[PDB]
Amino acid sequence: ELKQISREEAMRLGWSHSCHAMLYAANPGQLFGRIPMRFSVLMQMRFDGLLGFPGGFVDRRFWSLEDGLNRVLGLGLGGLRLTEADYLSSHLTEGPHRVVAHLYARQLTLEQLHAVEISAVHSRDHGLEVLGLVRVPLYTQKDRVGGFPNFLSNAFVSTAKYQLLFALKVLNMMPSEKLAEALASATEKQKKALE
Amino acid sequence: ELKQISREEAMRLGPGWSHSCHAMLYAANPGQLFGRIPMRFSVLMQMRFDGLLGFPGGFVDRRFWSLEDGLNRVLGRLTEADYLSSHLTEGPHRVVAHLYARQLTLEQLHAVEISAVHSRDHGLEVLGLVRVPLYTQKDRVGGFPNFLSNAFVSTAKYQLLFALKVLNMMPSEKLAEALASATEKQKKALE
């Protein structure tokens, strides 16, 4: 539960700033012809082995939040540019640093979301800061872990996991009761595996 | 620690056993992360529909496919020469997992990533490819240990560590250090 502050509050913090983008699309597809996918969200495997969102740190000495964000997306040259209209949230990170994390979000068409993936494999950052893109599975299979719970049990950039859960809720892509359910199962899996 | 069985013996197993074939595609990588630490090799893995990391591949019915043709059908060329190993997987059910590996140029490896976003499995069975970071940063978790902290198909995680060893891509002790670092990270995040 990271403390959310207003964008104005954030602009008055010795604090460093990060900007990340959550791109997503309604997804009519059905896995095995049976399981509704509902939505796909894009995340990235980072150079440091963690799953996060496209984006990174923004030096406000040099760039506005928006220009800084678009500089470090690592999504290639498919013509995608985020703006202030896509701004969603600012969160104070729990880190030993002092970081305020800004989240931008935009719903795309599934075709647009796919084109981003295709552009991304050619990014200047590909194989450097970004080791690949992955779609978030939002469904849960019959074994009660396949799909979203297993996915949440991967290793995340801490603020990125918080942001995913926060955005899924506030953008009404998933009932928060369902989110608690999936997270509970992820943590349980993680506990039993460590045993 | 999975029981390894010879190729000879695996292919004598009876109709009760199912066979899986997976491929570890890798390339020597001369790159330098931020100019400071050698990448050495890049290996391909993938996010699956079930939210786990694994290798490309899957089940092959030997009644209708050779192991190689069966593997290549899933991937679509890999040959017997690319075979590495056969392991009996942990139960419930009776599976022997075959591992194939091939070294590619880094350009060839990128060509695989390029073709993968257009495959019929993309967005269904496979949710995206990832490169394994084989380096470790100076905090001793960034890179490979963090990567090993993710959620794997258990057989794939074993095969990755096995293959890195036998292909002489990382020393056994370095593998052990990374896995130990991964595990400690997993412990701490939980509490």
CSV table of C-alpha atoms in Angstrom, one decimal:
chain,number,residue,atom,x,y,z
A,1,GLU,CA,0.0,0.0,0.0
A,2,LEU,CA,2.2,2.8,-1.2
A,3,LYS,CA,1.2,6.4,-0.3
A,4,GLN,CA,-0.4,8.1,-3.3
A,5,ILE,CA,0.1,11.8,-3.6
A,6,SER,CA,-1.2,14.4,-6.2
A,7,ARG,CA,1.0,15.4,-9.1
A,8,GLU,CA,1.3,18.8,-7.6
A,9,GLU,CA,2.5,17.4,-4.3
A,10,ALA,CA,5.1,15.4,-6.2
A,11,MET,CA,6.4,18.5,-8.0
A,12,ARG,CA,7.6,20.1,-4.7
A,13,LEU,CA,9.8,17.3,-3.3
A,14,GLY,CA,16.5,15.6,-2.8
A,15,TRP,CA,13.9,13.3,-4.3
A,16,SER,CA,14.4,11.4,-7.5
A,17,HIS,CA,11.6,10.8,-10.0
A,18,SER,CA,10.6,7.7,-12.1
A,19,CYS,CA,8.1,7.4,-14.9
A,20,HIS,CA,6.5,4.2,-16.1
A,21,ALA,CA,3.8,3.4,-18.6
A,22,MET,CA,1.1,0.7,-18.4
A,23,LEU,CA,-0.2,-0.2,-21.9
A,24,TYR,CA,-3.2,-2.4,-22.1
A,25,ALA,CA,-6.0,-3.6,-24.4
A,26,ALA,CA,-9.3,-5.4,-24.2
A,27,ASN,CA,-8.6,-9.0,-25.3
A,28,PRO,CA,-11.6,-11.0,-26.7
A,29,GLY,CA,-9.4,-14.1,-27.1
A,30,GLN,CA,-10.1,-17.3,-25.2
A,31,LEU,CA,-7.4,-19.6,-24.1
A,32,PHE,CA,-7.9,-23.2,-25.2
A,33,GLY,CA,-11.1,-21.8,-26.7
A,34,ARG,CA,-12.4,-21.8,-23.1
A,35,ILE,CA,-10.9,-19.2,-20.8
A,36,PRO,CA,-11.7,-15.5,-21.4
A,37,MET,CA,-8.5,-13.4,-21.4
A,38,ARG,CA,-10.4,-10.1,-20.9
A,39,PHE,CA,-7.4,-7.8,-21.0
A,40,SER,CA,-3.7,-7.9,-21.9
A,41,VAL,CA,-1.1,-5.7,-20.1
A,42,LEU,CA,2.5,-5.1,-21.3
A,43,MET,CA,5.4,-5.6,-18.9
A,44,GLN,CA,9.2,-6.0,-19.5
A,45,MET,CA,12.0,-8.2,-18.2
A,46,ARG,CA,14.7,-5.7,-17.2
A,47,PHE,CA,18.5,-6.0,-17.4
A,48,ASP,CA,18.5,-6.6,-13.6
A,49,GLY,CA,16.3,-9.8,-14.0
A,50,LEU,CA,13.1,-8.2,-12.6
A,51,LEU,CA,9.7,-7.7,-14.3
A,52,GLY,CA,8.8,-4.0,-14.5
A,53,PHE,CA,7.0,-1.5,-16.7
A,54,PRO,CA,8.4,0.4,-19.7
A,55,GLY,CA,10.1,3.5,-18.4
A,56,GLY,CA,12.8,4.6,-16.0
A,57,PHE,CA,14.2,7.5,-14.1
A,58,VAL,CA,13.7,11.0,-15.2
A,59,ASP,CA,16.1,13.8,-14.5
A,60,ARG,CA,13.9,16.8,-14.0
A,61,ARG,CA,17.0,19.1,-14.5
A,62,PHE,CA,16.7,18.1,-18.2
A,63,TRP,CA,13.3,16.8,-19.1
A,64,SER,CA,9.7,17.2,-18.1
A,65,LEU,CA,8.1,14.1,-16.8
A,66,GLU,CA,6.6,13.4,-20.2
A,67,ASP,CA,9.6,14.0,-22.3
A,68,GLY,CA,11.8,12.0,-19.9
A,69,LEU,CA,9.3,9.1,-19.9
A,70,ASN,CA,9.2,8.9,-23.7
A,71,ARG,CA,13.0,8.8,-23.8
A,72,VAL,CA,13.3,5.6,-21.8
A,73,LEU,CA,10.3,3.5,-22.9
A,74,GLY,CA,12.4,1.0,-24.8
A,75,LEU,CA,9.4,0.2,-27.1
A,76,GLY,CA,10.9,1.0,-30.5
A,77,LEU,CA,9.8,3.4,-33.2
A,78,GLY,CA,6.2,2.5,-33.7
A,79,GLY,CA,5.1,6.2,-33.2
A,80,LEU,CA,3.8,5.7,-29.7
A,81,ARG,CA,4.2,8.8,-27.5
A,82,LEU,CA,2.6,9.3,-24.1
A,83,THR,CA,1.4,12.7,-22.9
A,84,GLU,CA,0.1,14.5,-19.8
A,85,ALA,CA,-3.4,13.1,-20.7
A,86,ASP,CA,-2.1,9.6,-20.0
A,87,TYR,CA,-0.9,10.5,-16.5
A,88,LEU,CA,-2.6,8.3,-13.8
A,89,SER,CA,-0.7,8.3,-10.5
A,90,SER,CA,2.2,9.4,-8.3
A,91,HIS,CA,3.3,7.1,-5.4
A,92,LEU,CA,6.0,7.5,-2.7
A,93,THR,CA,8.2,4.4,-2.9
A,94,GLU,CA,9.0,2.4,0.2
A,95,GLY,CA,12.6,2.3,-0.7
A,96,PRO,CA,15.6,3.3,1.4
A,97,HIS,CA,16.0,6.0,-1.3
A,98,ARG,CA,13.5,8.7,-1.6
A,99,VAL,CA,11.8,8.1,-4.9
A,100,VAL,CA,8.4,9.3,-6.2
A,101,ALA,CA,7.0,6.9,-8.9
A,102,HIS,CA,4.7,8.3,-11.6
A,103,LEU,CA,2.5,5.9,-13.5
A,104,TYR,CA,1.1,6.7,-17.0
A,105,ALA,CA,-1.6,4.4,-18.5
A,106,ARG,CA,-3.2,4.1,-21.9
A,107,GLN,CA,-5.8,1.6,-23.3
A,108,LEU,CA,-4.9,0.5,-26.8
A,109,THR,CA,-6.6,-1.7,-29.3
A,110,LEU,CA,-5.3,-5.2,-29.2
A,111,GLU,CA,-3.8,-4.6,-32.7
A,112,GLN,CA,-2.1,-1.5,-31.4
A,113,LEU,CA,-0.8,-3.4,-28.4
A,114,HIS,CA,0.6,-6.1,-30.7
A,115,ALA,CA,2.3,-3.4,-32.9
A,116,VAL,CA,4.0,-2.1,-29.9
A,117,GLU,CA,5.4,-5.6,-29.2
A,118,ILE,CA,6.6,-5.8,-32.8
A,119,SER,CA,8.2,-2.4,-32.7
A,120,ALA,CA,9.8,-3.3,-29.3
A,121,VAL,CA,11.9,-6.2,-30.5
A,122,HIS,CA,13.8,-3.6,-32.6
A,123,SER,CA,14.2,-1.0,-29.7
A,124,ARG,CA,17.6,0.6,-29.2
A,125,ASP,CA,17.2,-0.8,-25.6
A,126,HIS,CA,16.5,-4.4,-26.7
A,127,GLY,CA,19.0,-6.7,-25.3
A,128,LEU,CA,20.4,-3.8,-23.3
A,129,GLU,CA,18.1,-2.4,-20.6
A,130,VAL,CA,15.1,-4.5,-21.9
A,131,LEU,CA,15.5,-8.3,-22.2
A,132,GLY,CA,11.9,-8.8,-23.5
A,133,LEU,CA,8.3,-7.9,-23.3
A,134,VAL,CA,5.6,-10.1,-21.7
A,135,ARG,CA,1.8,-10.0,-21.6
A,136,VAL,CA,0.2,-10.2,-18.2
A,137,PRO,CA,-2.3,-13.1,-18.0
A,138,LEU,CA,-5.3,-11.9,-16.0
A,139,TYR,CA,-7.2,-15.2,-15.9
A,140,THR,CA,-6.9,-18.0,-13.4
A,141,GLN,CA,-6.9,-21.7,-14.5
A,142,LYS,CA,-8.6,-24.6,-12.7
A,143,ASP,CA,-5.6,-25.5,-10.6
A,144,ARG,CA,-6.2,-22.0,-9.0
A,145,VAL,CA,-2.7,-20.8,-9.8
A,146,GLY,CA,-2.1,-21.0,-13.5
A,147,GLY,CA,-2.3,-17.6,-15.1
A,148,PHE,CA,-2.4,-14.5,-12.9
A,149,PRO,CA,-1.4,-16.0,-9.5
A,150,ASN,CA,1.7,-17.6,-10.9
A,151,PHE,CA,2.5,-14.4,-12.7
A,152,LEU,CA,2.3,-12.3,-9.5
A,153,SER,CA,4.8,-14.8,-8.0
A,154,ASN,CA,7.5,-13.8,-10.4
A,155,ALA,CA,10.2,-11.3,-9.2
A,156,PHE,CA,9.1,-7.7,-9.7
A,157,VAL,CA,10.5,-4.2,-9.4
A,158,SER,CA,8.7,-3.4,-6.1
A,159,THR,CA,6.9,-0.3,-7.2
A,160,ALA,CA,5.9,-2.0,-10.5
A,161,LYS,CA,3.9,-4.7,-8.7
A,162,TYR,CA,2.1,-2.1,-6.6
A,163,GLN,CA,1.4,-0.1,-9.7
A,164,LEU,CA,0.0,-3.1,-11.6
A,165,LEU,CA,-2.4,-3.9,-8.8
A,166,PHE,CA,-3.3,-0.3,-8.3
A,167,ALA,CA,-4.0,0.3,-12.0
A,168,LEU,CA,-6.0,-2.9,-12.4
A,169,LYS,CA,-8.3,-1.7,-9.7
A,170,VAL,CA,-8.7,2.0,-10.5
A,171,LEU,CA,-9.1,1.3,-14.2
A,172,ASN,CA,-11.7,-1.3,-13.3
A,173,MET,CA,-10.1,-4.1,-15.3
A,174,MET,CA,-10.4,-6.5,-12.3
A,175,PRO,CA,-12.6,-6.6,-9.2
A,176,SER,CA,-10.3,-5.8,-6.2
A,177,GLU,CA,-11.8,-8.9,-4.5
A,178,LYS,CA,-10.4,-10.9,-7.4
A,179,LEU,CA,-7.1,-9.1,-7.1
A,180,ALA,CA,-6.9,-10.0,-3.4
A,181,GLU,CA,-7.7,-13.6,-4.3
A,182,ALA,CA,-4.9,-13.8,-6.9
A,183,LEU,CA,-2.3,-12.1,-4.7
A,184,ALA,CA,-3.2,-14.4,-1.8
A,185,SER,CA,-2.6,-17.5,-4.0
A,186,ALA,CA,0.7,-16.0,-5.3
A,187,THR,CA,2.0,-15.4,-1.8
A,188,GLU,CA,0.8,-18.9,-0.7
A,189,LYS,CA,2.6,-20.5,-3.7
A,190,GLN,CA,5.7,-18.5,-2.8
A,191,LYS,CA,5.5,-19.7,0.8
A,192,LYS,CA,5.1,-23.4,0.1
A,193,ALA,CA,7.9,-23.3,-2.5
A,194,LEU,CA,10.3,-21.9,0.1
A,195,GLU,CA,9.3,-24.8,2.3
B,1,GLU,CA,17.7,-32.7,-8.5
B,2,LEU,CA,16.2,-34.7,-11.4
B,3,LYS,CA,17.2,-38.2,-12.4
B,4,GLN,CA,19.1,-38.2,-15.7
B,5,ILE,CA,18.6,-41.1,-18.0
B,6,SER,CA,20.5,-41.9,-21.2
B,7,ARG,CA,18.9,-41.2,-24.5
B,8,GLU,CA,19.2,-44.9,-25.3
B,9,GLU,CA,17.2,-45.8,-22.2
B,10,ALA,CA,14.6,-43.0,-22.6
B,11,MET,CA,13.8,-44.2,-26.1
B,12,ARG,CA,13.2,-47.7,-24.9
B,13,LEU,CA,10.6,-46.6,-22.3
B,14,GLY,CA,7.1,-48.0,-22.9
B,15,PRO,CA,3.8,-46.4,-24.0
B,16,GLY,CA,3.0,-45.4,-20.4
B,17,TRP,CA,5.7,-42.7,-20.6
B,18,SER,CA,5.1,-39.3,-22.2
B,19,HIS,CA,7.9,-37.4,-23.9
B,20,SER,CA,8.6,-33.6,-23.9
B,21,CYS,CA,11.1,-31.7,-26.0
B,22,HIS,CA,12.4,-28.3,-25.2
B,23,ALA,CA,15.1,-26.1,-26.8
B,24,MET,CA,17.6,-23.8,-25.2
B,25,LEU,CA,18.7,-21.4,-27.9
B,26,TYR,CA,21.7,-19.3,-27.0
B,27,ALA,CA,24.4,-17.0,-28.4
B,28,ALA,CA,27.8,-15.7,-27.4
B,29,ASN,CA,27.3,-12.0,-26.4
B,30,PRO,CA,30.4,-9.8,-26.6
B,31,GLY,CA,28.3,-6.9,-25.1
B,32,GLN,CA,29.1,-4.9,-22.0
B,33,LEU,CA,26.1,-3.8,-19.8
B,34,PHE,CA,26.6,-0.1,-19.3
B,35,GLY,CA,30.2,-0.7,-20.5
B,36,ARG,CA,31.0,-2.3,-17.2
B,37,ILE,CA,30.2,-6.0,-17.0
B,38,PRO,CA,30.4,-8.7,-19.7
B,39,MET,CA,27.1,-10.2,-20.8
B,40,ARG,CA,29.1,-13.3,-22.0
B,41,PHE,CA,26.0,-15.3,-23.3
B,42,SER,CA,22.3,-14.6,-24.0
B,43,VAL,CA,19.9,-17.5,-23.6
B,44,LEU,CA,16.2,-17.4,-24.7
B,45,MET,CA,13.3,-18.4,-22.4
B,46,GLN,CA,9.7,-17.4,-22.5
B,47,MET,CA,6.7,-16.4,-20.4
B,48,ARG,CA,4.0,-19.1,-20.8
B,49,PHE,CA,0.1,-18.9,-20.6
B,50,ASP,CA,0.3,-20.2,-17.1
B,51,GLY,CA,2.4,-17.3,-16.0
B,52,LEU,CA,5.6,-19.3,-15.6
B,53,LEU,CA,8.9,-19.0,-17.4
B,54,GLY,CA,10.1,-22.0,-19.4
B,55,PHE,CA,11.8,-23.0,-22.6
B,56,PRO,CA,10.2,-23.3,-26.1
B,57,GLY,CA,8.9,-26.8,-26.8
B,58,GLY,CA,6.4,-29.2,-25.4
B,59,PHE,CA,5.0,-32.7,-25.7
B,60,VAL,CA,5.9,-35.1,-28.5
B,61,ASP,CA,3.8,-38.2,-29.3
B,62,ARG,CA,6.4,-40.7,-30.5
B,63,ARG,CA,3.7,-42.7,-32.2
B,64,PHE,CA,3.4,-40.0,-34.8
B,65,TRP,CA,6.6,-37.9,-34.5
B,66,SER,CA,10.4,-38.4,-34.1
B,67,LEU,CA,11.7,-36.3,-31.2
B,68,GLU,CA,13.4,-33.9,-33.5
B,69,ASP,CA,10.5,-33.4,-36.0
B,70,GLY,CA,8.1,-33.1,-33.0
B,71,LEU,CA,10.3,-30.4,-31.4
B,72,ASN,CA,10.7,-28.5,-34.6
B,73,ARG,CA,6.9,-28.6,-35.2
B,74,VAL,CA,6.4,-26.9,-31.8
B,75,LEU,CA,9.2,-24.4,-32.5
B,76,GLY,CA,7.9,-23.7,-36.0
B,77,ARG,CA,16.0,-26.6,-37.7
B,78,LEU,CA,17.1,-28.6,-34.6
B,79,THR,CA,18.8,-32.0,-35.0
B,80,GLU,CA,19.9,-35.0,-33.0
B,81,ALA,CA,23.2,-33.3,-32.8
B,82,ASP,CA,21.6,-30.6,-30.6
B,83,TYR,CA,20.4,-33.1,-28.0
B,84,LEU,CA,21.8,-32.7,-24.5
B,85,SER,CA,19.8,-34.8,-22.1
B,86,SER,CA,16.8,-36.6,-20.8
B,87,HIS,CA,15.5,-36.3,-17.3
B,88,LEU,CA,12.7,-38.0,-15.5
B,89,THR,CA,10.5,-35.2,-14.1
B,90,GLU,CA,9.0,-35.0,-10.7
B,91,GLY,CA,5.6,-36.9,-10.5
B,92,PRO,CA,2.3,-36.7,-10.7
B,93,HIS,CA,2.8,-38.2,-14.1
B,94,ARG,CA,5.3,-40.2,-16.1
B,95,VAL,CA,7.3,-37.7,-18.2
B,96,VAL,CA,10.8,-37.8,-19.5
B,97,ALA,CA,12.0,-34.4,-20.5
B,98,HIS,CA,14.4,-34.1,-23.4
B,99,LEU,CA,16.7,-31.0,-23.7
B,100,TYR,CA,18.1,-29.7,-26.9
B,101,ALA,CA,20.5,-26.7,-27.2
B,102,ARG,CA,22.0,-24.8,-30.1
B,103,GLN,CA,24.4,-21.9,-30.2
B,104,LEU,CA,23.5,-19.2,-32.8
B,105,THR,CA,25.1,-16.0,-33.8
B,106,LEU,CA,23.7,-13.1,-31.9
B,107,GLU,CA,22.1,-11.8,-35.1
B,108,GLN,CA,20.5,-15.3,-35.5
B,109,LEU,CA,19.2,-15.2,-32.0
B,110,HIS,CA,17.6,-11.8,-32.6
B,111,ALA,CA,16.1,-13.3,-35.8
B,112,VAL,CA,14.4,-15.9,-33.6
B,113,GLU,CA,13.0,-13.1,-31.4
B,114,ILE,CA,11.7,-11.2,-34.5
B,115,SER,CA,9.9,-14.3,-35.8
B,116,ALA,CA,8.5,-15.2,-32.4
B,117,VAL,CA,6.2,-12.1,-32.1
B,118,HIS,CA,4.5,-13.2,-35.3
B,119,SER,CA,4.0,-16.8,-34.4
B,120,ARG,CA,0.5,-18.4,-34.0
B,121,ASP,CA,1.3,-19.2,-30.4
B,122,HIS,CA,2.1,-15.5,-29.5
B,123,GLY,CA,-0.6,-14.1,-27.2
B,124,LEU,CA,-2.0,-17.6,-26.6
B,125,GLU,CA,0.4,-20.2,-25.3
B,126,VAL,CA,3.4,-17.9,-25.2
B,127,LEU,CA,3.2,-14.4,-23.7
B,128,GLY,CA,6.6,-13.2,-24.8
B,129,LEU,CA,10.3,-14.1,-25.0
B,130,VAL,CA,12.9,-13.0,-22.5
B,131,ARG,CA,16.7,-13.1,-22.6
B,132,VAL,CA,18.4,-14.6,-19.6
B,133,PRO,CA,20.8,-12.1,-17.9
B,134,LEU,CA,23.8,-14.3,-17.0
B,135,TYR,CA,25.9,-11.5,-15.4
B,136,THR,CA,25.6,-10.4,-11.7
B,137,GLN,CA,25.8,-6.8,-10.7
B,138,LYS,CA,27.9,-5.6,-7.8
B,139,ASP,CA,24.9,-5.7,-5.4
B,140,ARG,CA,25.2,-9.5,-6.0
B,141,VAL,CA,21.5,-9.8,-6.8
B,142,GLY,CA,20.9,-7.8,-10.0
B,143,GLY,CA,20.9,-9.9,-13.2
B,144,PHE,CA,21.1,-13.7,-12.8
B,145,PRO,CA,20.1,-14.1,-9.2
B,146,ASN,CA,17.1,-11.9,-9.5
B,147,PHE,CA,16.2,-13.7,-12.7
B,148,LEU,CA,16.4,-17.1,-10.9
B,149,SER,CA,14.0,-15.6,-8.3
B,150,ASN,CA,11.2,-15.6,-10.9
B,151,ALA,CA,8.6,-18.3,-11.2
B,152,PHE,CA,9.6,-21.3,-13.4
B,153,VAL,CA,8.3,-24.5,-14.7
B,154,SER,CA,10.4,-26.5,-12.2
B,155,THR,CA,11.8,-28.8,-15.0
B,156,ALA,CA,12.8,-25.7,-17.1
B,157,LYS,CA,14.7,-24.1,-14.2
B,158,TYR,CA,16.6,-27.4,-13.6
B,159,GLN,CA,17.3,-27.8,-17.3
B,160,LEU,CA,18.6,-24.2,-17.5
B,161,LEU,CA,21.1,-24.8,-14.6
B,162,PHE,CA,22.0,-28.2,-15.9
B,163,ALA,CA,22.7,-26.9,-19.5
B,164,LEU,CA,24.7,-23.9,-18.4
B,165,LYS,CA,27.0,-26.3,-16.5
B,166,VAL,CA,27.4,-29.0,-19.2
B,167,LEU,CA,27.8,-26.5,-22.0
B,168,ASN,CA,30.5,-24.8,-19.9
B,169,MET,CA,28.7,-21.5,-20.0
B,170,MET,CA,29.1,-20.9,-16.2
B,171,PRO,CA,31.2,-22.6,-13.5
B,172,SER,CA,29.2,-24.8,-11.2
B,173,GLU,CA,30.1,-22.7,-8.1
B,174,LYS,CA,28.8,-19.5,-9.8
B,175,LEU,CA,25.6,-21.3,-10.5
B,176,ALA,CA,25.3,-22.3,-6.8
B,177,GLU,CA,26.1,-18.7,-5.6
B,178,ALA,CA,23.4,-17.2,-7.9
B,179,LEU,CA,20.7,-19.8,-6.8
B,180,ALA,CA,21.6,-19.2,-3.2
B,181,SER,CA,21.3,-15.4,-3.7
B,182,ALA,CA,18.0,-15.9,-5.5
B,183,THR,CA,16.7,-18.1,-2.7
B,184,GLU,CA,17.7,-15.6,0.0
B,185,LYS,CA,16.0,-12.8,-2.0
B,186,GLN,CA,12.8,-14.9,-2.1
B,187,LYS,CA,13.0,-15.5,1.6
B,188,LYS,CA,13.2,-11.8,2.4
B,189,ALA,CA,10.6,-10.5,0.0
B,190,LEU,CA,8.1,-12.9,1.7
B,191,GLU,CA,8.4,-11.6,5.2
